[PDB]
Amino acid sequence: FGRFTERAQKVLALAQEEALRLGHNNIGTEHILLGLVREGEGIAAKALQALGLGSEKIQKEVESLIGRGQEMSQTIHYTPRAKKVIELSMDEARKLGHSYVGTEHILLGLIREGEGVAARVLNNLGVSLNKARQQVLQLLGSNETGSSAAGTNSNANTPTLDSLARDLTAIAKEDSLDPVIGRSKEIQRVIEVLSRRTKNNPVLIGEPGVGKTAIAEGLAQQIINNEVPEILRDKRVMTLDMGTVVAGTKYRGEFEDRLKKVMDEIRQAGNIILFIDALHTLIGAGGAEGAIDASNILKPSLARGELQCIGATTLDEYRKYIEKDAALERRFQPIQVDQPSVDESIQILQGLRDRYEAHHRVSITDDAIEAAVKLSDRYISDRFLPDKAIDLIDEAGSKVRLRSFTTPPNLKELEQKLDEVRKEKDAAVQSQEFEKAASLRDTEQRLREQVEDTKKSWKEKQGQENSEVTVDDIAMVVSSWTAQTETDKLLNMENILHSRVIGQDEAVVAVAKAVRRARAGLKDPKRPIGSFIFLGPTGVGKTELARALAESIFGDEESMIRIDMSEYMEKHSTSRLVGSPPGYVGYDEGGQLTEKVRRKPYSVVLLDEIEKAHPDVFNILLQVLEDGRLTDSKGRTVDFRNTILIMTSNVGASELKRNKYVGFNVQDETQNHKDMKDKVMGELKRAFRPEFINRIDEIIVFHSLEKKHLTEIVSLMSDQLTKRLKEQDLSIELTDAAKAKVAEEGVDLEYGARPLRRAIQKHVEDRLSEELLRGNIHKGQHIVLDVEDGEFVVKTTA
Amino acid sequence: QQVLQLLGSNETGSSAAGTNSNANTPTLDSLARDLTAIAKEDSLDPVIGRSKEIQRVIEVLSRRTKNNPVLIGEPGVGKTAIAEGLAQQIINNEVPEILRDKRVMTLDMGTVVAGTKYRGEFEDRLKKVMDEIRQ
Amino acid sequence: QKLQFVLRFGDFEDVISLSKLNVNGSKTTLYSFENRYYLYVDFCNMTDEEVENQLSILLEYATESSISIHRLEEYGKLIISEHALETIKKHFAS
Incomplete structure (x- = not known):
C-alpha cells in the first residue's frame, strides 16, 4: 500500500525480532501476535494487555509453538500466514476510512486470520480471538481530529428534524465545519432576499457546475450570528434532503406524503430556512x-413565507418558475451565481487533491491543476469550467499511475521467467523427478527475489506519480478523450492542422490563429473558441479543416457537430428528412443544433452551405456566434461557448472546382492556381448576407480542385480504405507510387476524379486481399503498397 | 446418508480462512455475487477479450471526477468479458494505490426483478443500493 | 483430534521452506494438484500439545486445505511421496 501509521509498522518489525529470539526463523502469525504485544501498550499491544496478555506471555507461547532453537537467522522474513494478517489489517483501516493503517487494525487483521499460529497463541493464553479484535477497535480506529462536546437545546424542533434531515448549522458547532470555498459574494445577497416576510425566498442561478453547495455553508454561519434581522434571530437551516424522501418511499403517493409531512411541520415559518437543491423537480412546470x-402545496407556502426557502437552480431552470408568476415570483427573486471565472475553478481543484492522492497521483503538479482550469475553458469545453477541470486532473491523476506498475526497469522479463520455472518444476515433480523439480524450485525462488527487488525498484514510479498529476499528463488526458500537450496542441495547432489539410494554406493559418488566440485560455467562453466561415464550394478542403481542428484544437479527432442550412429552406431535405411546409427551422433551433452541442459543447459546429438558407436563419445562428448560447428545446441552454462555429458557403465553384491542366499552355496549371487563390476571397460575400459573417473570428478561404487535387483525392480515399481494414488487424501503408497506378484509371476528363475510389478498390483493397489470401503478406505485418516500374507491387515488412 | 456425506471436496486450487471488515454487510448481500470472489478461490475466468479495452478503464476509474468508465460497442462484442478482466487485476496487482483495495460488485438485473411487484418496488431496490453506496 | 491433515501450501516453495524448519514426526506426501501444492502431513503418534506445536510450523507456510485427502490421493499427484518434507530437505535444500 504505502501510507501507514508508526504503531502498525513498529508492531510488524517486532515479529522479526522475535523470529530469532524464539528460534522461529520464519515469522508466522505467532510472531505477528507477539509483535502486537511487543509494541507494549500501543493500541494493538494495549488491547492484548486488556484480555490478559503481556509481551512476555506471548513470546513464550510463541516459542512453545515452533520451539527454540531452530535459528540461524535463516532469511527471517514473513511467511504466507503472517502475510494474510497484513492484507486484512489494511482493510480493517480502509473500513474506518483510514488511508493509513495503525496498530488497532493490525490486531484487527490478526484476529481475522484467526487460524494459524497467532490464533493458537491467543487461544492458548486464555484470550478469545474476537475478544481481542473488539478490544483494539474500541480503543482507537482511524486517526482524525476536529470534535467538540457539551450543550443541548430546544423542544419545538422535535417533529421536523427527525424525518428528514440533518441540520446544516449543527456540524459547524460540532467542529466538523467545511467552508466550502465559493462564490462568497453570492452569500451576502441571500439575506436581503431571505429576511423578508413577503418575497422571502432566494433563488440562486448559475450552472451545476459552479459547486452551488459551497455557497450554502456560508448561510449556516450567518444564520447563527447575526447578520439576519433582530426577531429574525433564532433561525434554523434545515435542508430538504431528497435522499431521505426517497428512502422508505416506493410510490408517487408516498413521495407526496413525505412532502406533506415536511409542509405540516413548516409552521416554524418566517424564521425557518428550508434549503431545496435542484428546485425544478418539485414545481413540475414546463416541458412535454x-x-x-409538489407545486400545489409549495405555491401558497412560498407566497406565505411558511416555506421561506432557498432555491438552487442552474442556467436553464429559471424559465419554469417565472412562468408561474407570482407565487413563485412573489416568492422568488434572483441572484447571480457565476458561469465560473477561471480562478474559482483553481481553488476547487487544489481542494480535491489529497483524495485523488487516493488514486495516488494528484496532489500536485501545480501547473497541471492550472492546466485543468486554463485548458478547460477552451480544451474540454464540454461541461462548465470546474467539472471539465477536475476530470482532466484525475484522468491524468491515474493515467500515469497506470503507466507506473507496467514493468520493473525492463526486468519484466524476470516475471515472465519465474512463471516458466513453476511449469517445468511442477510437471517434473508430477512425474517425480523429485530433484528434477527441486533445482527448478530453487531457480524459481531465486528469480522471485530478483523480480520483487526490481519491481519495488519501481517504487520510483510511485515517487513519480504519488504527488504529481503531470502538466503534460493533464493536458494529454484532455487530448485523449476529445499545460503541456494541450498548450503544445494550441501553440502548434497550425502544425497539426497542416498535416491533415493539403492545399488551402490560406484557410489553415486563418483558423489556427483565431482559435489559438481564444484557445490560449485567455478568452472567456461566452462565444465560440473560433467562429468561422469556410469558403469555397463543396470539395475544396473546408470540412477537412474542421476535422483537423478537432484533432489540433481539441487534441483528438472527436467532437464535431454538423447542421445543414440547406434543410432550412425546405428544398434540399424536405423529402429526405421528415416534415411538411411548417417544419424545418423548428427542428433545428428547437432540437437538432442545440441538443447536439449540449452533448459535446466542444464541437466544431459546421452550419453548411449558408447561401441556401435565407438570411433569417442566420440571425438565430448569430446569437450562437456572439453570445455562445441559444435557449431552445423546452428552455434548455446550450453552451456554444466552447464550440467552434464554422459556417460553410456556396462560393466560387467554377474555378474552385476547375483543375490545372493545359488549356493553352503549361501555364494553364499556374493559372488554375493563382486564379483559385483569388476566386474564394471575392465569392464569399456573394454567398451570404453580411449580418451573419461579421461575428466570425477570421474569414477562412479554401481554394479549388487543381490537378494536383486529383492525386490528393486518391490519398484521401486510399487512407480511409486501409484504416477501416485496420480493425481486422491489417497494418497497411500506401506509397505515393501506388496511388499513381490507381490514378491511371481515373484521369478521365469525362468522369472526373470519381473513378479513383473504384481504382483504389481494384489496386489496394482487392490487391491486399489477393495477397493476404495467398499468404504472401499477413495481418499484423506492415504492408507497403508501391508501384515498381509501372505496375503495382505489394511488399511486406514487420 | 453415508455415501452422500463423503462425496469428497474437490477444489480448483482454492484457499480460505477468515474475512475482513464490518461495513460490507448491508450492501454485498442483496444483490449480488462479486467478480472478485471467484478469483480469490481460483475459479477465475479466462476471460478472452477485448484486452486493450481493459487498460483504458483504469484511467477513467482511478478518477474521482470522470470516475465512471463507459464501454461503447455491439452487444454482442462479449463486452462482459472485459469486466472480469478488471476483477482479477484489481486484486493482484497492477492498479493504483487505492485500486488495490477496490472491490467490484455487479448490479444484477435478475436480483432486482426477483421479488418485485411493480416499477415502484424496482425503484425501492435501487434506492436501497444508493443508501449503502457509501462504500 | 487431528493427526493427519491436508494442508495447502501456497506453492511447492512453501513446502520446502517448511521442510527447512522442524517438521519432524511427519510422514508426509506432497501433492501438486491444480498446480497448488497440498502437503499431506500424516503425524504418526503426537499428543494435542505436540500437534498444536507442529501444525503451527506447517501453518506458518500453509493454511489447512479444504481439499479432502482422498482427493489428493486420487485427483492429485505426488511430488515427493515418502516423508515429503524430509525428502525435500535432501533434494531442495542448499
Whole structure:
C-alpha cells in the first residue's frame, strides 16, 4: 500500500525480532501476535494487555509453538500466514476510512486470520480471538481530529428534524465545519432576499457546475450570528434532503406524503430556512414530460413565507418558475451565481487533491491543476469550467499511475521467467523427478527475489506519480478523450492542422490563429473558441479543416457537430428528412443544433452551405456566434461557448472546382492556381448576407480542385480504405507510387476524379486481399503498397 | 446418508480462512455475487477479450471526477468479458494505490426483478443500493 | 483430534521452506494438484500439545486445505511421496 501509521509498522518489525529470539526463523502469525504485544501498550499491544496478555506471555507461547532453537537467522522474513494478517489489517483501516493503517487494525487483521499460529497463541493464553479484535477497535480506529462536546437545546424542533434531515448549522458547532470555498459574494445577497416576510425566498442561478453547495455553508454561519434581522434571530437551516424522501418511499403517493409531512411541520415559518437543491423537480412546470407536482402545496407556502426557502437552480431552470408568476415570483427573486471565472475553478481543484492522492497521483503538479482550469475553458469545453477541470486532473491523476506498475526497469522479463520455472518444476515433480523439480524450485525462488527487488525498484514510479498529476499528463488526458500537450496542441495547432489539410494554406493559418488566440485560455467562453466561415464550394478542403481542428484544437479527432442550412429552406431535405411546409427551422433551433452541442459543447459546429438558407436563419445562428448560447428545446441552454462555429458557403465553384491542366499552355496549371487563390476571397460575400459573417473570428478561404487535387483525392480515399481494414488487424501503408497506378484509371476528363475510389478498390483493397489470401503478406505485418516500374507491387515488412 | 456425506471436496486450487471488515454487510448481500470472489478461490475466468479495452478503464476509474468508465460497442462484442478482466487485476496487482483495495460488485438485473411487484418496488431496490453506496 | 491433515501450501516453495524448519514426526506426501501444492502431513503418534506445536510450523507456510485427502490421493499427484518434507530437505535444500 504505502501510507501507514508508526504503531502498525513498529508492531510488524517486532515479529522479526522475535523470529530469532524464539528460534522461529520464519515469522508466522505467532510472531505477528507477539509483535502486537511487543509494541507494549500501543493500541494493538494495549488491547492484548486488556484480555490478559503481556509481551512476555506471548513470546513464550510463541516459542512453545515452533520451539527454540531452530535459528540461524535463516532469511527471517514473513511467511504466507503472517502475510494474510497484513492484507486484512489494511482493510480493517480502509473500513474506518483510514488511508493509513495503525496498530488497532493490525490486531484487527490478526484476529481475522484467526487460524494459524497467532490464533493458537491467543487461544492458548486464555484470550478469545474476537475478544481481542473488539478490544483494539474500541480503543482507537482511524486517526482524525476536529470534535467538540457539551450543550443541548430546544423542544419545538422535535417533529421536523427527525424525518428528514440533518441540520446544516449543527456540524459547524460540532467542529466538523467545511467552508466550502465559493462564490462568497453570492452569500451576502441571500439575506436581503431571505429576511423578508413577503418575497422571502432566494433563488440562486448559475450552472451545476459552479459547486452551488459551497455557497450554502456560508448561510449556516450567518444564520447563527447575526447578520439576519433582530426577531429574525433564532433561525434554523434545515435542508430538504431528497435522499431521505426517497428512502422508505416506493410510490408517487408516498413521495407526496413525505412532502406533506415536511409542509405540516413548516409552521416554524418566517424564521425557518428550508434549503431545496435542484428546485425544478418539485414545481413540475414546463416541458412535454413534466416532473411530480409538489407545486400545489409549495405555491401558497412560498407566497406565505411558511416555506421561506432557498432555491438552487442552474442556467436553464429559471424559465419554469417565472412562468408561474407570482407565487413563485412573489416568492422568488434572483441572484447571480457565476458561469465560473477561471480562478474559482483553481481553488476547487487544489481542494480535491489529497483524495485523488487516493488514486495516488494528484496532489500536485501545480501547473497541471492550472492546466485543468486554463485548458478547460477552451480544451474540454464540454461541461462548465470546474467539472471539465477536475476530470482532466484525475484522468491524468491515474493515467500515469497506470503507466507506473507496467514493468520493473525492463526486468519484466524476470516475471515472465519465474512463471516458466513453476511449469517445468511442477510437471517434473508430477512425474517425480523429485530433484528434477527441486533445482527448478530453487531457480524459481531465486528469480522471485530478483523480480520483487526490481519491481519495488519501481517504487520510483510511485515517487513519480504519488504527488504529481503531470502538466503534460493533464493536458494529454484532455487530448485523449476529445499545460503541456494541450498548450503544445494550441501553440502548434497550425502544425497539426497542416498535416491533415493539403492545399488551402490560406484557410489553415486563418483558423489556427483565431482559435489559438481564444484557445490560449485567455478568452472567456461566452462565444465560440473560433467562429468561422469556410469558403469555397463543396470539395475544396473546408470540412477537412474542421476535422483537423478537432484533432489540433481539441487534441483528438472527436467532437464535431454538423447542421445543414440547406434543410432550412425546405428544398434540399424536405423529402429526405421528415416534415411538411411548417417544419424545418423548428427542428433545428428547437432540437437538432442545440441538443447536439449540449452533448459535446466542444464541437466544431459546421452550419453548411449558408447561401441556401435565407438570411433569417442566420440571425438565430448569430446569437450562437456572439453570445455562445441559444435557449431552445423546452428552455434548455446550450453552451456554444466552447464550440467552434464554422459556417460553410456556396462560393466560387467554377474555378474552385476547375483543375490545372493545359488549356493553352503549361501555364494553364499556374493559372488554375493563382486564379483559385483569388476566386474564394471575392465569392464569399456573394454567398451570404453580411449580418451573419461579421461575428466570425477570421474569414477562412479554401481554394479549388487543381490537378494536383486529383492525386490528393486518391490519398484521401486510399487512407480511409486501409484504416477501416485496420480493425481486422491489417497494418497497411500506401506509397505515393501506388496511388499513381490507381490514378491511371481515373484521369478521365469525362468522369472526373470519381473513378479513383473504384481504382483504389481494384489496386489496394482487392490487391491486399489477393495477397493476404495467398499468404504472401499477413495481418499484423506492415504492408507497403508501391508501384515498381509501372505496375503495382505489394511488399511486406514487420 | 453415508455415501452422500463423503462425496469428497474437490477444489480448483482454492484457499480460505477468515474475512475482513464490518461495513460490507448491508450492501454485498442483496444483490449480488462479486467478480472478485471467484478469483480469490481460483475459479477465475479466462476471460478472452477485448484486452486493450481493459487498460483504458483504469484511467477513467482511478478518477474521482470522470470516475465512471463507459464501454461503447455491439452487444454482442462479449463486452462482459472485459469486466472480469478488471476483477482479477484489481486484486493482484497492477492498479493504483487505492485500486488495490477496490472491490467490484455487479448490479444484477435478475436480483432486482426477483421479488418485485411493480416499477415502484424496482425503484425501492435501487434506492436501497444508493443508501449503502457509501462504500 | 487431528493427526493427519491436508494442508495447502501456497506453492511447492512453501513446502520446502517448511521442510527447512522442524517438521519432524511427519510422514508426509506432497501433492501438486491444480498446480497448488497440498502437503499431506500424516503425524504418526503426537499428543494435542505436540500437534498444536507442529501444525503451527506447517501453518506458518500453509493454511489447512479444504481439499479432502482422498482427493489428493486420487485427483492429485505426488511430488515427493515418502516423508515429503524430509525428502525435500535432501533434494531442495542448499
